[PDB]
Amino acid sequence: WYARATIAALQAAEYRLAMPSASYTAWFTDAVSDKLDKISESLNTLVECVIDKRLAV
Amino acid sequence: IWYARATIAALQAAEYRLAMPSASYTAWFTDAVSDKLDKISESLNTLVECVIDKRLAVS
Amino acid sequence: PSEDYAIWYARATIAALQAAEYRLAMPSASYTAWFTDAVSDKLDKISESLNTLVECVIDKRL
Amino acid sequence: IWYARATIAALQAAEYRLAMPSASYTAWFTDAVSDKLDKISESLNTLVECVIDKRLA
Amino acid sequence: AIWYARATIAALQAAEYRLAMPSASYTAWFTDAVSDKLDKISESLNTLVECVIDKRLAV
């Protein structure tokens, strides 16, 4: 009965995420955020090169 | 005693439905993902409008 | 309940919670709607901008 | 009796290690994220193709 | 039974949940789902940048 009522309780509820641990954010940074930084930098380089091709004498 | 073994069992058997995250998580997530996507999107708009229209993309 | 019960419960519950792993269900509608605004819609705009770029680059080779 | 107060404190004292998500989650996440990454990736590679092809010709 | 469901669910929804380092099982899935595609996108973008710069700097 306990295993069932607990599972029923766990699946009935909703879960609000707090701030993640320092360990999670370190993992997420390498998995996602650092890559986004590099993609932003690469893209801004490309934009600036294209703009400079339009503006250069 | 037995309360630890059956509880782990219940926890692993269950599935967990995320609610809206806390203001704290969302503010972290906005910095780690959403704000960067905005800058990337705005940069690609700039690229496109310069290449296509020879004008500056504006927000 | 006694303090000794309280301590056992806290230690047993925390140990069980950290021993287990958590399989995510379909998120609630509030989460998926938030995530769509936070992430998915921005990826769509990025994707659409690239499609316009590709279309124009390919076309100029007319 | 004293259960929900002690339970809340335990739930918030622990940290949570995510497992492989359910099939419903991954099916959802694929539509919400990964399918769009694939489309973005495909469009970038087409752009690389064109710029390379012009270089070779 | 009624009370247990009631107070346990009340507690679960009142608490907030701090993510640990995810399991290797989750990161393996998330790598396929996200991080590998981010890698590929970055590599293509970098190739595009380098070739547009290469043509600018050529001869």
Numbering used by the authors:
A (entry chain C): 9 to 65
B (entry chain A): 8 to 66
C (entry chain E): 2 to 63
D (entry chain B): 8 to 64
E (entry chain D): 7 to 65
What's the publication's text?
Orsay, the only virus known to naturally infect the nematode Caenorhabditis elegans, expresses a capsid-δ fusion protein. We have demonstrated that the Orsay fusion protein is incorporated into Orsay capsid and forms a ~420-Å long fiber protruding from the capsid surface. Our model predicts that δ consists of three domains: an N-terminal helical domain that is covalently linked to the capsid, a middle shaft that is mostly β-stranded, and a C-terminal head that likely hosts the cell receptor binding site for host attachment. By analogy with other viral capsid-associated fiber proteins, the Orsay CP-δ likely functions in cell entry as a cell receptor binding protein.
Among these four constructs, only δ(1–66), which contains the first 66 residues of δ, produced crystals diffracted to better than 3-Å resolution. The structure of δ(1–66) was determined by single-wavelength anomalous dispersion (SAD) using SeMet-substituted crystals. By subsequent molecular replacement and refinement against a native dataset, we were able to establish the final structure to 2.2-Å resolution. δ(1–66) assembles into a pentamer with the five subunits forming an α-helical bundle. This five-helical bundle is ~80-Å long and ~35-Å wide. Each δ(1–66) molecule folds into two α-helices that are connected by a 9-aa linker (i.e. residues 21 to 29). The longer α-helix, consisting of residues 30 to 63, has a kink at around residue 40. The helix after the kink contains three regular heptad repeats (i.e. 40VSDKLDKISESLNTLVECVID60, in which hydrophobic residues are highlighted in bold). Surface representation of the δ(1–66) pentamer shows a ~3 to 5-Å wide channel running through the entire molecule. Therefore, the core of the entire helical bundle is mostly hydrophobic, except for a single location at T14.
